[PDB]
Design an enzyme around this catalytic site. Structure first.
Site: not given
Ligand SMILES: Nc1nc2c(ncn2[C@@H]2O[C@H](COP(=O)(O)OP(=O)(O)OP(=O)(O)O)[C@@H](O)[C@H]2O)c(=O)[nH]1
Ligand SMILES: *C(=O)[C@@H](N)Cc1ccccc1
Lengths: 205, 85, 61, 82, 392
Positions: E21, E24-25, E84
């Site tokens: 969260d 990265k995605t 994870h």
């Molecule tokens: N407001 C805001 N929200 C963000 C930002 N970056 C990510 N998010 C939120 O954070 C959530 C992260 O989901 P992922 O993108 O899957 O997070 P991750 O880092 O890839 O985590 P993993 O899926 O476990 O690899 C997303 O649903 C976005 O809505 C940002 O720069 N600003």
RNA sequence: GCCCGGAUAGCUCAGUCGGUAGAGCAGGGGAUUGAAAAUCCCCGUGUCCUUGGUUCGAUUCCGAGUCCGGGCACCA
RNA sequence: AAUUGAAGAGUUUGAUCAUGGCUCAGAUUGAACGCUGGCGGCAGGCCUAACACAUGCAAGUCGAACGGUAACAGGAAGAAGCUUGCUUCUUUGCUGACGAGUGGCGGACGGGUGAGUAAUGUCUGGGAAACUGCCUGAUGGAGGGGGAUAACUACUGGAAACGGUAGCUAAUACCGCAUAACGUCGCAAGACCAAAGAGGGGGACCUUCGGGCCUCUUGCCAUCGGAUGUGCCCAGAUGGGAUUAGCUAGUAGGUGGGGUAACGGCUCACCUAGGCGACGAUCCCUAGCUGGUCUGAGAGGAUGACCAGCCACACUGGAACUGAGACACGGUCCAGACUCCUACGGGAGGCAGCAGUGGGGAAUAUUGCACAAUGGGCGCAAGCCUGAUGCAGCCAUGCCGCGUGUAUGAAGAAGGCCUUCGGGUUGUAAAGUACUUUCAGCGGGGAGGAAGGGAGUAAAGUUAAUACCUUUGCUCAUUGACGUUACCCGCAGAAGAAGCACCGGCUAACUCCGUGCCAGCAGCCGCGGUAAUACGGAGGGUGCAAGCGUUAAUCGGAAUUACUGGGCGUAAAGCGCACGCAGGCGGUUUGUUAAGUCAGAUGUGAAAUCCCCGGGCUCAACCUGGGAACUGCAUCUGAUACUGGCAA
């Protein structure tokens, strides 16, 4: 395809000589013949019907060294020939080139003769033949390739040639390393000690 | 299917409209001759027969009929006119 | 039903095997030997004679 | 169309053609009417190598047989002079 | 398939590491859209990355989606790794392809142990350069604590012998940039700009005997089972007979397919993110954990020596010093193999924070090399970070 | 790659919401006998799959991993 | 020159002789598995799911048919740089050639699979109520006009698929008029019916300056042919089951109409009341057929993979159109199921074609190279298309040949093994030594499969013609996928290459140690109970060999389905007896028919395979020439003993 193992132990199992090691020695003697075909060579064999004709069949195969698959092939060819099937079989088995060159004296023994065959050292009718399975036809001439001539081995083998009976259905030169096949072998012109009568009967079952 | 020999498809469609149309006109003339035979007037049937004659002849020569069927239509139809009179 | 060949095996409720023919005349009904040397039914341990049967390979030493 | 074509027979790398009269709508080694002879392009200076029943070829061309130019070349190589 | 790969730009293989969260995605999706204005060839979204049902069942990345984009000066192939603990398996697969990783660090929380765990394996996998991305700065506008959280990022690389003070600090909102907030999209342009100044060209020795690890297993319909990865050393062409070393017997096959990003390629070389198609092999015969190599070169071994550095509970490792017989899972590029530790005489309690050595013997036969940097995990958490001292 | 169920002495299961593990079917060791059925005389042979953690103490508390079986996918 | 060919043993019992099943020894296969594994030549390689399928490719071609030319390369006019012809370059169908379109032809051949089908099929032998593009032979004609459309423009529906409305133009596309015959209908008189021009070259002539005209190749229409292919009918033959005994009603047949290329209940209307059936109909189950392969002394039994002919099918089922021919694999329409695209209105698709994949399974191959050769399609041709084919990769699947070396070598060693501890044995085996080098490895030379085609040229023909064109020779440069070929030469060096089952009798070949009705062995008799030639190991030996065994399957032995060639009183087996229809067989005499029979002749029995004598690949496997055979069938002409028919 060759026995390529104890080339003299074969004669021990059958009790008689098979010329595998005639060589430059007149009489072998250091072979322990007739007293021990093997470890239990002093034991008297039962010698059953099937076995005695089998030992007769196996004796000729140890002479020419030909295996069963090719010997079964020779039987059928002799079978499809008219006349006497049993007598046909010895004509074919003496027709192999390695055997013919053996009769010429170019080859000490059949084993030594086969070496000249496969190493393209023999040339018949101006045609070098590497296959020992060449059934020689009547009226032809055999020889040795110039480069494979007098290379220290065929010369001494020629000395062994004067101690043999030298067959009459073919002729050799021995002056320019040449030989010629006059006619096919007669049943009355061969070793006469070998039997082919029971060999016909073994393959009939 | 993806083969440039799909031309025979649309060509046969264009060929069938032509063929079917010409064969239906040939058959209606055969229906025309029978009515006169059903009427009984040999002269009317005579007139009907001689006009459809040059029609079926021209169609078999164009490769539409196998020439024997063409002959039979002219044959058994004449078998009707002699029985009629 | 199927006969288990050789000395000692390791089958337990599963382990996919191979079935070949052969009556044994000792166990009534049994008409099949298990092909030792194939699939998850390992060959026997330490058999130098007739290793074609019981899947023993030629000594690596 | 009745033709006097060939037919590949023999071993791999060792070809042997069999001049034959057949229907043009049949396979290469399929059904025919009758053979005329044979063709040995991989022959030697033995004594043979080609035997063409030139009479039988002529008996079909009168009926309407179309000779293929490879066979017609062999007809020219079995020369009508010698 | 079509479209043979053109070598017009210097190709680099990058990827992302971070935390669950952190975005990265979200960033990988935002990266392509910003690059889409200078070159419309990717324009990848969030769902283009997370293509699995479970990935859309919990809104998380569990599988490594591959994406590439090129700058007017270079070419980059980014890898989105899962974030994870129980998904560290696919994380290391993405980490093995990195010539340089990028840290997606949310300035809201910063250094979480799980984030430290991502750099720990990175150092152990061989990541030389990491460009940090101060993500989620859109909701944290307190610039005072923005510098405070930036300071702790600088020191974490410092205590792990990495230039955190030299590392290019890139702020940015992965979410707003994905929608089109030009200010945050410029952050991605700053991300792309720093991407071309902090990443050198890695040397790939293609003249060496061919070696190729196994990253993932696929089964394309009508083609059979194809396997992907990154060629360590050596080269391959179509029709090149090779062999594979795994946890079981050596099998033979010939190359019949060299592709990159669903696009064709004639010859495969070291470093490139390509894949090879085996000849007539079933999905059951090939599974993740094996390795391709040149014919008649490597025989699988079963024992080696290795030094190591154990983490502490407040570092991610253990809090209880263990004894002989303890068997954690030795992780190296594509495996989760468990082995028994044969410790050297003199030490009975390996306390959390040791830099001692050990001799390792595994339960599975595998191909290995001297000097291989790997890590050790156990019970869902990383316990060790060692180096292959010597093979036996 | 993820989500569960069996992993308990030859075999099948019970025993837990921490306290030094049971039963049954077995089978086996001796005396009688040519050898046994039988009879008389005695019976547990256990890594609770492996390893570590919260430990006066874990079969049972938390999980990792391996084996087997059963579902989803992913598709260079 | 053309079948010179037939084996038995173990087990019932205390012992024997019969009877009688059971079992093994042999060969074989589209093989699988275990183990091992050098090369090469020739063949074979999804037997189950006729299960579902991504992608590439598998049938296109003709400008010497036409309107045109969107592109490519020239010619030509022009235009701009500027070295004034050095370049750039807007137009022009005027050429070479050519996407898209019309038309011609092919797409019904080639290729695959074996599901269905027990007779509508196949095979053998006949028959008449037929048709037959392209090819070829004979005789004629080939005269004169008209009307549309695709392409292409304008506009426009639909995401795509895929069209729509209004106009332009040509032809070997289509439709007339003329002319018709030994062609069609009819007894005849009579009536009626066909078509298409382009291509090359050229003298006089002629030139609305397109061209006509002359001439040569080719093509078009009709009729009778031929050949080939195809359709149809009859007789016989072509599986098991009688625990399937009646079945059939457009059914058996006739008449008339219609229909088919052609005959007919093929289909209809009326009438008649019949048709098949034990020498086996319907029904049930299984199965492609034959030539052949294997086996066997033959007779037979089994079987139907590859090669070749024939039939059937194309996701399931059904129908029809085009066309000479399909009632159609890479065609059409509909319905159904299964996948796919989607802008959710509506559409796309059929690998049992080469490959390839998931899946099934004990198990069966590369998303390769080329049109050089053969064959096929179109074209005048050059050529173009060609997963037919020619080749290659992979697999010991089969068959054959070859290799892992030859000679010498006694202290008759070491070590292993047994032992009467004497010694024997492993054993010329090895080392040592002297030679050799096949095939692999490496490096150079180097066949043939190639016939032709194209340009030039000479001559003979056709012709006004030394032109065009056609035929026969010659000349130059050549067309080779395989292919770092076949084959030959050279170099290094015993160098890189031996395993598999078995050893109680059957059935060729042994002891010891160890385990003691335990473990295991096994085809049968059966072994093992503390001295095992049968279990396991070790040594030795046996058989076979790059294969050796195991299992499945077939025939053989099995005269245990007996026609050749078995039996029935007691071993399995006489119906309880008798009458008697069909059926089977039948004394003796003469004649006769000449069916059966037998002789000879004829057609046929496809080819290949099987057999004999030869030839070529170093030999063989393999290929190949001639001959024989194909043991069967139909016709004709004779023979009259024997069987049968008629008559006394
Ligand atoms: N407001 C805001 N929200 C963000 C930002 N970056 C990510 N998010 C939120 O954070 C959530 C992260 O989901 P992922 O993108 O899957 O997070 P991750 O880092 O890839 O985590 P993993 O899926 O476990 O690899 C997303 O649903 C976005 O809505 C940002 O720069 N600003
Ligand atoms: C295949 O395209 C690889 N070059 C990149 C990749 C994409 C998706 C999943 C795994 C590898």
């Amino acid at each position: 395809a060759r026995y390529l193992g104890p080339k003299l132990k074969l004669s021990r199992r059958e009790g008689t000589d098979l010329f595998l090691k005639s060589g430059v020695r007149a009489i072998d003697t250091k072979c322990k013949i007739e007293q021990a075909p093997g470890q239990h060579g002093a034991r008297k064999p039962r010698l059953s019907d099937y076995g005695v004709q089998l030992r007769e069949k196996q004796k000729v195969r140890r002479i020419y060294g030909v295996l069963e698959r090719q010997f079964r092939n020779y039987y059928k060819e002799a079978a499809r020939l008219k006349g006497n099937t049993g007598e046909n079989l010895l004509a074919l088995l003496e027709g192999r080139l390695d055997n013919v060159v053996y009769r010429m004296g170019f080859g000490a023994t059949r084993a030594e003769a086969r070496q000249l065959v496969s190493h393209k050292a023999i040339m018949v009718n101006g045609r070098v033949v590497n296959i020992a399975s060449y059934q020689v036809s009547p009226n032809d001439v055999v020889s040795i390739r110039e480069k494979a001539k007098k290379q220290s081995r065929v010369k001494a083998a020629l000395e062994l040639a004067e101690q043999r009976e030298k067959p009459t259905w073919l002729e050799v030169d021995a002056g320019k390393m040449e030989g010629t096949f006059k006619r096919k072998p007669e049943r009355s012109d061969l070793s006469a000690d070998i039997n082919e009568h029971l060999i016909v009967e073994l393959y009939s079952k | 299917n993806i083969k440039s020999a799909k031309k025979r498809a649309i060509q046969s469609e264009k060929a069938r409209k032509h063929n079917a149309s010409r064969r239906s006109m040939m058959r209606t003339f055969i229906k025309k001759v029978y009515a006169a035979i059903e009427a009984g007037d040999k002269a009317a049937a005579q007139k009907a027969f001689n006009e459809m004659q040059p029609i079926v002849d021209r169609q078999a020569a164009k490769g539409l009929i196998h020439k024997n069927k063409a002959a039979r239509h002219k044959a058994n139809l004449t078998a009707q006119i002699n029985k009629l009179a | 039903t199927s006969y288990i060949g050789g000395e000692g095996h390791n089958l337990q409720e599963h382990s996919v095997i191979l079935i070949r023919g052969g009556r044994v005349k000792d166990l009534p009904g049994v008409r099949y030997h298990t092909v030792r040397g194939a699939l998850d039914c390992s060959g026997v341990k330490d058999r130098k004679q007739a290793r074609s049967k019981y899947g023993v390979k030629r000594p690596k030493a | 169309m009745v033709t006097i074509r060939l037919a590949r027979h023999g071993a791999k790398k060792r070809p042997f053609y069999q001049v034959v009269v057949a229907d043009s709508r049949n396979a290469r080694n399929g059904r025919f009417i009758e053979r005329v002879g044979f063709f040995n392009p991989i022959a030697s200076e033995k004594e043979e190598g080609t035997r063409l029943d030139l009479d039988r070829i002529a008996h079909w061309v009168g009926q309407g047989a179309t000779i293929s130019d490879r066979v017609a070349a062999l007809i020219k190589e079995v020369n009508k002079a010698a | 398939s079509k479209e043979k790969f053109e070598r017009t730009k210097p190709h680099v293989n990058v990827g992302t590491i971070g935390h669950v969260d952190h975005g990265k995605t979200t960033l990988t999706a935002a990266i392509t859209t910003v690059l889409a204005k200078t070159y419309g060839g990717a324009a990848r979204a969030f769902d283009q990355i997370d293509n699995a049902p479970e990935e859309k069942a919990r809104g998380i990345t569990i599988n490594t989606s591959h994406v590439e984009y090129d700058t007017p000066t270079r070419h980059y192939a980014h890898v989105d790794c899962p974030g994870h603990a129980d998904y560290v398996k696919n994380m290391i697969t993405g980490a093995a392809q990195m010539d340089g990783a990028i840290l997606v660090v949310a300035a809201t929380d910063g250094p979480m142990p799980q984030t430290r765990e991502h750099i720990l394996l990175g150092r152990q996998v061989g990541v030389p350069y990491i460009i940090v991305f101060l993500n989620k700065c859109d909701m944290v506008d307190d610039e005072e604590l923005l510098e405070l959280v930036e300071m702790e990022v600088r020191e974490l690389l410092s205590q792990y012998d990495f230039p955190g003070d030299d590392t290019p600090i890139v702020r940015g909102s992965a979410l707003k940039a994905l929608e089109g907030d030009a200010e945050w999209e410029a952050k991605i342009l700053e991300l792309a700009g720093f991407l071309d100044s902090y990443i050198p060209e890695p040397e790939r020795a293609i003249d060496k005997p061919f070696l190729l690890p196994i990253e993932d297993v696929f089964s394309i319909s009508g083609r059979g089972t194809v396997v992907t990865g990154r060629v360590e050393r050596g080269i391959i062409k179509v029709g090149e007979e090779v062999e594979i070393v795994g946890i079981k017997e050596t099998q033979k096959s010939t190359c019949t397919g060299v592709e990159m990003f669903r696009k064709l390629l004639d010859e495969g070389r070291a470093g490139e993110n390509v894949g090879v198609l085996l000849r007539g092999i079933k999905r059951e015969e090939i599974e993740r954990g094996q390795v391709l190599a040149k014919p008649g070169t490597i025989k699988p071994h079963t024992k080696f020596e290795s030094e190591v550095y154990i983490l502490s509970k407040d570092e991610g490792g253990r809090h209880t010093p263990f004894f002989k017989g303890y068997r954690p899972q030795f992780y190296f590029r594509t495996t989760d193999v468990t082995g028994t530790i044969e410790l050297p005489e003199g030490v009975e309690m390996v306390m959390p924070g040791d830099n001692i050595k050990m001799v390792v013997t595994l339960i599975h036969p595998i191909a290995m090399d001297d000097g291989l940097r790997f890590a050790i995990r156990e019970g869902g958490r990383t316990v060790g970070a060692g180096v292959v001292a010597k093979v036996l």
